[PDB]
Design a protein around this nucleic acid. Sequence first.
DNA 1: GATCGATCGATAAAGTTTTTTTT
DNA 2: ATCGATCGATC
Lengths: 243, 663, 130
Amino acid sequence: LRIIWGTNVSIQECTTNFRNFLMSFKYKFRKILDERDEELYYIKQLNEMRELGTSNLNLDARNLLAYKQTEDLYHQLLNYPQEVISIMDQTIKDCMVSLIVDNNLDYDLDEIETKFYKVRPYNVGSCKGMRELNPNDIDKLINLKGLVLRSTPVIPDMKVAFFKCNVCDHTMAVEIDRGVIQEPARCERIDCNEPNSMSLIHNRCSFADKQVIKLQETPDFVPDGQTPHSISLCVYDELVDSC
Amino acid sequence: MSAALPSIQLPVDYNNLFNEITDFLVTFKQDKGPKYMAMLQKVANRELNSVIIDLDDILQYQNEKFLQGTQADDLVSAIQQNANHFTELFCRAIDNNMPLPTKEIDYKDDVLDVILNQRRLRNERMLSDRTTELFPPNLTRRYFLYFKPLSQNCARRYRISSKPLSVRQIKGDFLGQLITVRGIITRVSDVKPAVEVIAYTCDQCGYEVFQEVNSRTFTPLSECTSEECSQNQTKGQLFMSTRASKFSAFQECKIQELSQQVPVGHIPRSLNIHVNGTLVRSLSPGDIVDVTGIFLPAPYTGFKALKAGLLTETYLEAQFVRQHKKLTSDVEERVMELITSGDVYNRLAKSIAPEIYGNLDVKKALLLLLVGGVDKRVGDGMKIRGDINVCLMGDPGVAKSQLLKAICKISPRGVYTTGKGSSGVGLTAAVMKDPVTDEMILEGGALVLADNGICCIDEFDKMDESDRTAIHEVMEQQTISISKAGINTTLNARTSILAAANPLYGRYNPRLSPLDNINLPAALLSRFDILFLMLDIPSRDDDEKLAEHVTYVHMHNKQPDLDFTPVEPSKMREYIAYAKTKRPVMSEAVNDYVVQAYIRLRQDSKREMDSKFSFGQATPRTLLGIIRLSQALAKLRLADMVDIDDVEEALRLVRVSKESLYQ
Amino acid sequence: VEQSFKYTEPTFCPNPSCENRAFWTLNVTRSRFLDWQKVRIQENANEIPTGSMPRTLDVILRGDSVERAKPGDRCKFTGVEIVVPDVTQLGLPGKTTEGLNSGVTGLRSLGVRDLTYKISFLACHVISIG
DNA sequence: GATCGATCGATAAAGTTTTTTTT
DNA sequence: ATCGATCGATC
């Protein structure tokens, strides 16, 4: 398996380890919540993703703790929580395709296989507010309980750039993918195009949404002297102005 | 350079102290061999990150170095002659006697475990990958140091550093030293990650560059500086990475003075404090505490020419905090004393507030409100009222706040207010100005923080344009809210009210009509339940005893009177909590008799119909109060005897409620 | 031609080999103008869920459409969108972490700064039903 | 003609008790 | 006082 300078995560075993766990489930968790279920919620819901065409799978994600294997995947979610959702967005596209390869009459194998679906691991773990957030908590999942206060409208974000200098027609479109925009110091598109006025046409390249919300926690059994403090929020997906 | 750069011939170096730190290997076996090395084992296995290098392990280290006739310089001098040079040479002395692999951690059970070895091994392999930069010593620490002074009889043995000075006299030679100061902690900030190491990534060579952290502003470096990804025609463009650098804790607080060591003149003076290591999240606003720590001034690095020529604006850096004055859980030997002796109705009445004249009946009317009494777990959509509110009136010359609010200053969750300051808009929460940090926070008064407790108020004719509506809004059920332009959210309301409305000019004329000094009749008619009064009649026999009640307190400096064995307030505080774990359920014999007790309460109020003295006109809103306080007195007197004998104690207290004006 | 959102300096392609980008002189004679105004809008009453600080934005009217927009009425608009930054120029020297996307937007070919981008709106034609 | 080095110029600041009519 | 831009000199 591969090895990253940053993480120690594996190759696509855990994707396949999820995919057999996903498909061959039909019931689990009967023992941790022992009371005494013929088919999994997700099994019907994974069929339900295509027939509405949505992009969101609200994963409970307390299923890896119920499963015998995939604990290593489970205890890598809470320790490198950016690559693991970046892995699983590729798999859910293929695991959807794993249903289209059975029935080839499912939306012609092209158009719903362009818009990238995504997932949402929610209600995982437990947390207790703000007076426990140590500096060691750098890349982890946190479960806040509080109250939002006030919102600003959406400002845009540099997801793609554009350039055009002063020649006849040269309409390149560089990417950013960082906090760094890279530029050329000499022209192109012709032989005799020396270092010249490369200009930045700004109102042409597209942008996504982004929104910051301010939160202040509820006084949840606060010790009657401490002022309830505040922390901010940030969002990227299609959840702007739904809260 | 020239011009006095050669310093003086100082007889005090650090190399003469440095070898006298190298001797701090295993030689002090008294305090299971070297006990500071024993504490060194309980940190490497990662369960606590605070060592304590105190002074008793230095003076006894010198006490048993008294007999060896060799030159041993003083240690407690230099660690308070200049304290800040005694954290860094310890760290270059700990590592020579630091047993690393004493623990067993494979993959999990340690934060950041595999990556720190990965960040070590990727530089360990690149120490010999030429067929090079060593670690700065601040990188692989995962630990801190602390200190602890002394003010015991060891200082009275022989030869200060820990005298509890005040901030009024700390102006002089106390820079770069170690001084403990007491005070009152105010303006607590939050916890923010500070930076101690750095790692920029070039994404070409992978040599994460390291640097030390200076004061609160710094600057990144270039990209053509490294040893592999520099020096060629292509250079790895630098950018940062979070997780390749550790981050510490940080919190700021301000001190004030004790309001008794201050002289007759000027106002008290503030000071700045910081925290490091793991003493964080251990202070509170209102802590009557003291900190022990080392001293350091810091530069300003802004607008340096036209202001701040040589000024200092210093702070102090903390080392140790010594905080003070903080259900069958091994105090039951004192909780059984109420269960063995009993004596609920009178000994507990004489227990709370024994400093008054008479009035044992009215001190019983408050203590059942101190245990409250839950109405009903209703389940369905019937949010019924609980937590009745008793109000007082009358004009004595005793300044009766000591007769009410002394209970409020020992009762649990009982906050006090006055007329000025927190108005009715200032009773609930609001949005106000703040410092340069996150403004428009939800500051409040009492009822947004005294939920399910005691709200003891005075001065009912003060700031009434906002007060008089909002006090109804807790008796009006569940509408404590902030309906400003900011938001329209609503929080809860579960707190009892004790009110003492002061009367109007002169004595309240009893021949005159009531509601001549009370403001709102609508609160009194059904939104309250019972009243009391504090009339004065000139009496020959009682007042000379009352004269002896007040003249006797100036001979001694106490009030030894009234032949009662005084009880600590924590006892019934547990018994209120012990009653809170009971919640008795009513029987059926009670409502067979109280139904006509309301009828006995019906025609007598309908007999008078006069505007001369009395109030009340036979409503069930008066009736449901005596149903509420009956189970309340059954809660403090739990034998599960909810019967007629329990409810006759209730009508015992309501017959003295009315006709308090008939004298 | 075509002065952009900050291009107060036409300094490209002189006729002879004179000192290019040395100066300018905004002639009030031949450079034709047009007239505009900048107003704020607000959301209609029959769509607010609660009193939840009803947000807004700003428009620009360009042609003859000036003064047709009587303030304080229900109104419709054309619909072209735009984004406009303005932080660095010749004259005046150019809470929370608003403009956090701006740190990505640094390092253009001129001086390193923190250029933002705020959403705005342009119109072309107005109508006022009611 | 291009690149590098040196010199010169420009860039960073902060508010909230008395007094008027008015309801 | 520090950083950036412009001008001059040298290769």
